[PDB]
């Protein structure tokens, strides 16, 4: 209980940790009905508005006023933000020219540049194009500071998951806020936008920036503001806190606005009604920068201007209804709209039939505007499966559409797949620690927590950013990364066996009379991947490829090869169709066997280096080695053969050659991390040959396309995929057609970062290059989006 009778005199917005039964005066008290009775009279002054006027200049200080224009206000720290402009012939910050900030210019008593995070909700990246005509203060920050053309949010692209990802560096499946609404089957409790449950700390995982700061002795201003505190008051409060005594002043601050999200929902992102809220946000940035200038802090503080997600055109007329597909929608609960999550209405209802539901939702209308997925089948790049709050059945919804259970005040919405263009949002950093007038490539919001820790001198808690990948945003305070240590060194087996030693069931129609040589220099362009876990594997060399063959998983961990721009594609000769060859370098006991494949009526096999790309008819025989074989369902072979036979050469032709590394991934427990042996759950029939859940490929070339991939001087260009290894093509509605009509569409959906592959394989790539380690970390976080 809270003793309301207390008072907020000289307590306004205090940074005091104060609770039961004492009444509060802090920026969150209203949200807890815990404010002293006079909080609103003393702390939320509104009198005479937010701007000094010429008449008020040198007034007698009335403490009833929202802000002051009296002679004393400046050292007191509570001037209106335009005080000096109106009353002292100063210029607005926006009217001053940009000048480089080479070191911080902070008042005596400041030991580090403060960080202010200015977050804006639903700020679509493309709004920045409106430029200084609409948002001159923001445009100054953008042009003079360090800006990305956009920042990628996390999925789902809604507020709670994204704000908490920004604060923690974690994917939602890890921090726990997997939605704006969620059901937790263990709590048997429901988190809603509206209401009290969300205040319970049990929902919120990981460690947010303000906690990391506090635990390391850095004072944070309170990040959250009760919704009733107006933006102008939030700015005045931040400015007041910055004027505190050296022993009280915080080092990190956050401002938040619900705009332009609110207006985007009402009017849509391209509505003329959007100009006004963008102007209002810019005005707020203006007040902040004018205020900082009056305090002599505009060349001292680092400012981050960042959004949570964008906004798409979505209206009532574009709604799919589950009742058009399913007979009894009254028995399910749907988290609806721009994504779908389905569970039974009655928790654990034994009559719930998810396989039947998914069957009725799969490719049932030719224009269908969503696609069902069991969560383990969602693109791995979404990282959206490893949490009990994520329903098994998910609907990925097409941009511009809604999905609803059964049968207009809105024109915009968000929540869609985070690679969708309209979902991208904004990042600008301005201040002494950021670079001056620098554009940087788009990057993901999970990376910002490490950077904010760097800006504040903090050691980040374990998170999903790749620390160092954003060093190029910073003038100083960079993080020096260190290459992870190789755990398992390879073996280099020679010939140790005779064809006679092998009883595998393999046959091939293949003068009786494979050294390293230049294999590595040609086919392994960036060094051998390091194996970061304890295991046993062999380097195997060939004319056309090299591989790291695992003696434990009975297949290559990786297979590396380079295809020139001019390379020749050739067939598999009829007499070699079923050819599999024993590999005399590897024990028969560490080899697969063709009999398992014969016996398994559902499982077939494929190859990592494709016979289609062999350099000569004799080199082609290497491609049929048992050590180049992997288990593949026929459905998957449709994709894989098309990739191997058509696409790789297409990429080589377009990129002036390519280097490919391909391989298996085991993620049976869908946690985005390499499985240990115990976690593998499927084997080829009658064998101990494990079945990959996915196959990856990493395709690298020279960023300067005028240079061949094998003679590249400078930066690299990479695209990668993590393809789901599935027994059917139900995901691809057009799969009955020729592969030229559907395979590339599937691959684009399952694009991936090299970093994603590293997590899933326990491998570390690009260890031997001419680039810096920070540059390589940037490369490994790149996602080719195809938008």
Ligand X SMILES: *[C@@H]1O[C@H](CO)[C@@H](O[C@@H]2O[C@H](CO)[C@@H](O[C@@H]3O[C@H](CO[C@H]4O[C@H](CO)[C@@H](O)[C@H](O[C@H]5O[C@H](CO)[C@@H](O)[C@H](O)[C@@H]5O[C@H]5O[C@H](CO)[C@@H](O)[C@H](O)[C@@H]5O)[C@@H]4O)[C@@H](O)[C@H](O)[C@@H]3O)[C@H](O)[C@H]2NC(C)=O)[C@H](O)[C@H]1NC(C)=O
Ligand Y SMILES: *[C@@H]1O[C@H](CO)[C@@H](O[C@@H]2O[C@H](CO)[C@@H](O)[C@H](O)[C@H]2NC(C)=O)[C@H](O)[C@H]1NC(C)=O
Residues of this chain that bind ligand DWY (CB under 6 A): 117, 119, 121-122, 158-159, 163-164, 166-167, 180, 193, 223-225, 227, 254, 256, 258, 261
Residue 21 Cβ, how far from ligand Y at the closest point, in Å? 6
Q: Are 523 and 545 in contact (CB under 8 A)?
A: yes
**Which of these segments, 351-359, 396-404, 493-501, 740-748, binds ligand Y (CB under 6 A)?**
351-359
Between 445 and 659, name the residue whose CB sits nearer to Zn ion. Answer: 445
Distances (CA, A) of 645 to 560, 567, 696: 16, 12, 16
Q: Has 673 been labeled as part of a binding site?
A: yes
Say if residue 503 is preceded by a cis peptide, omega within 30 of 0: no
* Rounded Cα gap, residues 43 and 94, in angstroms: 29
Q: Has 421 been labeled as part of a binding site?
A: no
Does 636 contact Na ion by CB under 5 A? Answer: no
Residue 736 Cβ, how far from Na ion at the closest point, in Å? 7
Write the binding mask 1 to 20 for ligand Y: x where contact by CB under 6 A, - elsewhere.
--x-xx--------------
Write the binding mask 358 to 387 for ligand Y: x where contact by CB under 6 A, - elsewhere.
--x---------------------------
**Three-class SS state of 198:** helix
Write the binding mask 142 to 181 for Zn ion: x where contact by CB under 5 A, - elsewhere.
-----------------x----------------------
Residue from 744, 555, 771, 545 nearest 659 by CA: 545
Distances (CA, A) of 732 to 207, 363, 369, 492, 647: 39, 8, 13, 42, 18
Residue showing the smallest CB distance to Zn ion in the complex: 159
Between 4 and 682, name the residue whose CB sits nearer to ligand Y. Answer: 4
Phi and psi, residue 295, nearest 5°: -85, 0
Place of tokens 């309209």: 422
Breaks, C-N > 2.5 A, in the chain lie after 407, 510, 513
Place of tokens 């003038």: 475
Residue 122 Cβ, how far from Zn ion at the closest point, in Å? 5
Q: Has 367 been labeled as part of a binding site?
A: no
DSSP state of 47: B
Does 263 contact Zn ion by CB under 5 A? Answer: no
Q: Are 487 and 534 in contact (CB under 8 A)?
A: yes
What does 357 interact with, of ligand Y, ligand X, ligand DWY, none (CB < 5 to 8 A by kind)? ligand Y
Write the binding mask 636 to 675 for Ca ion: x where contact by CB under 5 A, - elsewhere.
-------------------------------x-x-x-x-x
Does 684 contact ligand Y by CB under 6 A? Answer: no
* 13-27 core/surface letters (b: 16 or more CB in 10 A; e: else): bbbeeeeeeebbbbb
Between 152 and 674, name the residue whose CB sits nearer to Ca ion. Answer: 674
- DSSP states along 699-729: EEEESSTTS-GGG--S-EEEEEEEEE--SS-
What does 326 interact with, of ligand Y, ligand DWY, ligand X, none (CB < 5 to 8 A by kind)? ligand Y
What does 463 interact with, of K ion, ligand Y, ligand X, none (CB < 5 to 8 A by kind)? ligand X
Q: Has 675 been labeled as part of a binding site?
A: yes
Q: Has 308 been labeled as part of a binding site?
A: yes
Q: Has 309 been labeled as part of a binding site?
A: yes
Write the binding mask 287 to 326 for ligand Y: x where contact by CB under 6 A, - elsewhere.
---------------------------------------x
Residue from 459, 553, 413 nearest 209 by CA: 459
Write out the H or E segment, with its range, that includes residue 183. strand 182-184
Q: Has 261 been labeled as part of a binding site?
A: yes
Give the tokens for residue 521: 């220099």
Distances (CA, A) of 120 to 115, 259, 441, 565, 665: 16, 6, 21, 46, 38
Give the tokens for residue 413: 């919405």
What does 620 interact with, of Na ion, ligand DWY, Ca ion, none (CB < 5 to 8 A by kind)? none
**Three-class SS state of 54:** helix
Q: Has 669 been labeled as part of a binding site?
A: yes
Could you tell me the end-to-end alpha-carbon distance of the chain, in angstroms, rounded to an integer?
53
What does 735 interact with, of ligand DWY, Na ion, ligand Y, none (CB < 5 to 8 A by kind)? Na ion
Residue 4 Cβ, how far from ligand Y at the closest point, in Å? 8
Contacts of 502 (CB under 8 A, 6+ apart): 582, 588, 591
What does 671 interact with, of Ca ion, ligand Y, Na ion, none (CB < 5 to 8 A by kind)? Ca ion
Between 122 and 221, name the residue whose CB sits nearer to Zn ion. Answer: 122
- DSSP states along 375-404: GGGS-GGG---SSTTS-SEEEEEPTT-EEE
Residues 471, 560, 735, 751: which binds Na ion (CB under 5 A)?
735
Q: Are strands 115-121 and 146-147 parallel, antiparallel or unpaired?
A: unpaired
Is the sign of the CA dihedral 472, 466, 697, 784 positive or negative? negative
Q: Has 247 been labeled as part of a binding site?
A: no
Write the binding mask 693 to 732 for Na ion: x where contact by CB under 5 A, - elsewhere.
------------------------------------x--x
Write out the H or E segment, with its range, that includes residue 275. helix 275-294
**Three-class SS state of 500:** helix
The residue annotated as part of the active site, out of 81, 146, 157, 159, is: 159
* Rounded Cα gap, residues 357 and 351, in angstroms: 12
* Rounded Cα gap, residues 164 and 178, in angstroms: 10
**Which of these segments, 38-46, 191-199, 255-263, 364-372, binds Zn ion (CB under 5 A)?**
255-263
Q: Has 671 been labeled as part of a binding site?
A: yes
Contacts of 599 (CB under 8 A, 6+ apart): 685, 686
Between 37 and 748, name the residue whose CB sits nearer to ligand Y. Answer: 37
Residue 580 Cβ, how far from K ion at the closest point, in Å? 12
What does 119 interact with, of ligand DWY, ligand X, Na ion, none (CB < 5 to 8 A by kind)? ligand DWY
Which residues form the interface with ligand X (CB under 6 A)? 170-171, 173-176, 205-206, 383, 386-387, 462-464, 672-673, 759
Write out the H or E segment, with its range, that includes residue 265. helix 261-267
Residue 98 Cβ, how far from ligand DWY at the closest point, in Å? 26
Does 320 contact Zn ion by CB under 5 A? Answer: no
Residue 124 Cβ, how far from Ca ion at the closest point, in Å? 35
Confirm whether 466 is a catalytic residue: no
Report the phi/psi class of residue 363: left, alpha or beta, with left for phi > 0 and alpha for psi in -120 to 50: left
DSSP state of 293: H
Q: Has 414 been labeled as part of a binding site?
A: yes
**What's the half-sphere exposure (Cβ side, CA atoms, 13 Å) at 404?**
10
* Rounded Cα gap, residues 769 and 766, in angstroms: 6
* Rounded Cα gap, residues 317 and 496, in angstroms: 69
Write the binding mask 320 to 349 for ligand Y: x where contact by CB under 6 A, - elsewhere.
------xx----------------------
Between 237 and 732, name the residue whose CB sits nearer to Na ion. Answer: 732
User: Which residues are known catalytic residues?
Assistant: 159
Residues that bind ligand Y (CB under 6 A): 3, 5-6, 21, 326-327, 353, 356-357, 360
| Interaction site with Na ion (CB under 5 A) | 729, 732, 735
Instruction: Provide the binding-site residues for Zn ion, judged by CB under 5 A.
Output: 121-122, 159, 261, 308
Q: Which residues are annotated as a binding site?
A: 121, 159, 180, 261, 265, 308-309, 414, 667, 669, 671, 673, 675
Residue stretches of the annotated binding site for 1-hexadecanoyl-sn-glycero-3-phosphate: 159, 180, 261, 414
Binding site for K ion (CB under 5 A): 597, 600, 604
């Amino acid at each position: 209980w809270t003793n309301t009778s207390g008072s907020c005199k000289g307590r306004c917005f205090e940074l005091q940790e104060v609770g039961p039964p004492d009444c509060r005066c802090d920026n969150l008290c209203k949200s807890y009905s815990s404010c002293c009775h006079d909080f609103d009279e003393l702390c939320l002054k509104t009198a005479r508005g937010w701007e000094c006027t010429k008449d008020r200049c040198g007034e007698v200080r009335n403490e009833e006023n929202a802000c002051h224009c009296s002679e004393d206000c400046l050292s007191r720290g509570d001037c209106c933000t335009n005080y000096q402009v109106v009353c002292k012939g100063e210029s607005h910050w926006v009217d001053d020219d940009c000048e480089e900030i080479r070191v911080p210019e902070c008042p005596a008593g400041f030991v580090r540049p403060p960080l202010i995070i200015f977050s804006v909700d639903g700020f679509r990246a493309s709004y920045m194009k409106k430029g200084s005509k609409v948002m001159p203060n923001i445009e100054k920050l953008r042009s003079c500071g360090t800006h990305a053309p956009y920042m990628r949010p996390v999925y789902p692209t809604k507020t709670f998951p994204n704000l908490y990802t920004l604060a923690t560096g974690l994917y939602p499946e890890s921090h726990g806020i997997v939605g704006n609404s969620m059901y937790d089957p263990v709590f048997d409790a429901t988190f809603h936008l509206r209401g009290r449950e969300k205040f319970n700390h049990r929902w919120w995982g990981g460690q947010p920036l303000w906690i990391t700061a506090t635990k390391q002795g850095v004072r944070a201003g309170t990040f959250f503001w009760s919704v009733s505190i107006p933006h102008e008051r939030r700015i005045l409060t931040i400015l007041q806190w910055l004027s505190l005594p050296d022993n009280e002043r915080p080092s990190v601050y956050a401002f938040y606005s619900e705009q332009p999200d609110f207006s985007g929902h009402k009017y849509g992102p391209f509505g003329p009604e959007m100009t006004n809220p963008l102007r209002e946000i810019d005005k707020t940035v203006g007040q902040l920068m004018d205020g900082l200038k009056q305090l002599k802090l505009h060349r001292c503080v680092n400012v981050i201007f960042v959004g949570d997600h964008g906004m798409e055109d979505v209206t009532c007329d574009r709604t799919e209804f589950l009742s058009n597909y399913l007979t009894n929608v009254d028995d399910i609960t749907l988290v609806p709209g721009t994504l779908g999550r389905i569970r039974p209405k009655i928790p654990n209802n034994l009559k719930y039939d998810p396989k039947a539901i998914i069957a009725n939702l799969t490719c049932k209308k030719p224009d269908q505007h969503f696609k069902p997925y069991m969560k383990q089948h969602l693109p791995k790049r979404l990282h959206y499966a490893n949490n009990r709050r994520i329903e098994d059945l998910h609907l990925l919804v097409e941009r511009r559409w809604h999905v609803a259970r059964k049968p207009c005040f809105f024109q915009g919405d968000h929540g869609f797949d985070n690679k969708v263009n309209s979902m991208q949002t904004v990042f600008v950093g301005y201040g002494p620690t950021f670079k001056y007038r620098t554009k940087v490539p788009p990057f993901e919001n999970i990376e910002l927590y490490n950077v904010m820790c760097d800006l504040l001198g903090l050691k980040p808690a374990p998170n999903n950013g790749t620390h160092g990948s954003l060093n190029h945003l910073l003038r100083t305070n960079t993080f020096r990364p260190t290459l992870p240590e190789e755990v398992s060194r390879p073996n280099y087996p020679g010939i140790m066996y005779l064809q006679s030693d092998f009883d595998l069931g393999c046959t091939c129609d293949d003068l009786e009379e494979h050294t390293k040589g230049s294999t590595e220099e040609r086919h392994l362009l960036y060094g051998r991947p390091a194996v970061l876990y304890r295991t046993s594997y062999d380097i195997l060399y060939h004319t056309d490829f090299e591989s790291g063959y695992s003696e434990i998983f009975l297949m290559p961990l990786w297979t590396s090869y380079t295809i020139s721009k001019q390379a020749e594609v050739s067939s598999i000769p009829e007499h070699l169709t079923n050819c599999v060859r024993p590999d005399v370098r590897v024990s028969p006991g560490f080899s697969q066997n063709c009999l398992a494949y014969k016996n398994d009526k559902q499982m077939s096999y494929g190859f990592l280096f494709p016979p289609y790309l062999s350099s000569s008819p004799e080199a082609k025989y290497d491609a049929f080695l048992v050590t180049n074989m992997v288990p593949m369902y026929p459905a998957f072979k449709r994709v894989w053969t098309y990739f191997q036979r058509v696409l790789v050469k297409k990429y080589a032709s377009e990129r002036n050659g390519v280097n490919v590394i391909s391989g298996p991934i085991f993620d049976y427990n869908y946690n985005g991390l390499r499985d240990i042996e115990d976690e593998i759950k499927q084997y080829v029939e009658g064998s101990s040959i494990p079945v990959p859940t996915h196959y990856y490929s990493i395709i690298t070339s020279c960023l300067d396309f005028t240079q061949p991939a094998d003679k590249c001087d400078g930066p690299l260009s990479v695209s990668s995929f993590i393809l789901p290894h599935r027994p059917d093509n139900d995901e691809s509605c057009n799969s009955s057609e020729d592969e030229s009509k559907w395979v590339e569409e599937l691959m684009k959906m399952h694009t991936a970062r090299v970093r994603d592959i590293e997590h899933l394989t326990g491998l570390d790539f690009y260890r031997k290059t001419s680039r810096s380690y920070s540059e390589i970390l940037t490369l490994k976080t790149y996602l080719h989006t195809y938008e």
